[PDB]
Amino acid sequence: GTVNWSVEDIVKGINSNNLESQLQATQAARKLLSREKQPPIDNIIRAGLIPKFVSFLGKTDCSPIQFESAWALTNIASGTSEQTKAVVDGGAIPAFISLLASPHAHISEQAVWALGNIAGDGSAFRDLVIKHGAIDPLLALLAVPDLSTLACGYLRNLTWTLSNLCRNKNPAPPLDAVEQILPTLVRLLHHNDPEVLADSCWAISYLTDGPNERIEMVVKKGVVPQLVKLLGATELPIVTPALRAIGNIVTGTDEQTQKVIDAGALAVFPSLLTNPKTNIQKEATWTMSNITAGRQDQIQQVVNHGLVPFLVGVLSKADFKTQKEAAWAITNYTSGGTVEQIVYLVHCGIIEPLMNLLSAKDTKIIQVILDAISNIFQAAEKLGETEKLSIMIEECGGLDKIEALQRHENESVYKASLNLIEKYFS
């Protein structure tokens, strides 16, 4: 019936003055745009069909053509920025927002989806969707006593679109828009559907990626314990954004970081730091590095939770990206830690894997490692143990590695290493 129409036929139907013919042709367009491979989005755009689809959105008297054009426009908007722009340029934004009030759940849902694609394109369209007043009617769709009464797919689409309104930076979303959205987000974060949880965590992760003021507005909503709970979920699609959000939060103030610790987050890290997915290990190690950049009492928590041997572990063997984060965690630890905490570090076996990493071509990690080594010597100086450390670095091949670095290209590298040698290795 409406399967596999040429664009030409679609145009002919839509240009006819017969609403049924238009409906038929519009559905045909929807099916082209929904096919598995290479939807002919540009061809549809060039045929000049967008203004017609947009006008069909306003036809309250013919709900099916509203649905079909909503669906077609949604899929056009799912493409490149230029393709999304064509949809916006046609006046689709306010028309879609008007459809959020539709008595037909399947039409309202489709409009939710479309606005998600538009906002998803980037900051400008995101903020334009907000300026057109999308937030109030979107939130109103979620104003029910129990989210469980909503159709599952419907709730998922709502959550996803809301997460796109929280997404992107340069600039980040308007503060008042974030305040307006947050209480619903907190609520979605306690829902029991895995996809709603995943997308809610993504939204929280976007919101906490920025200046400490941004983190604060999320953290004061009391979501950290729930985020930590989700950190221990069995679904990787939940753990991943939950962990990204926890990582973002510990980039904040000592107080913001302490909330993460207080909520029991550190107890999950033996699993995270040995997680089969390398991206989880990397994010988790990055997180640890920002925690070891914290207060001495926060470093002590890392110690108490038995996490230092886990850091020695990733420093010893992990993908290179994770190893670099491990190196950072060590330099941060030795910069902020007490002498005793630093001594503990050496006793866990940090020295050997630390030295082995000096074979890395990465110039930045070499700097990180040399610094850490400097910091550890400074602690051994307070204890008069400098020579015990020199010998330790000597026997694992470290001194050989420091020696060569004297001839390294980078200025601070050979300078840092020359200092080490002519000081502790003479």
Binding site: S78, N117, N290
Partner: peptide, 23 residues
């Protein structure tokens, strides 16, 4: 004592910006 290190930009693990409805 060092400063915190904010997230460095990247879209790799990041989920899709947009969704096309197939059915």
């Amino acid at each position: 004592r060092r400063r915190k290190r904010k997230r460095e930009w990247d879209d790799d693990d990041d989920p899709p910006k947009k969704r096309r409805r197939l059915d």
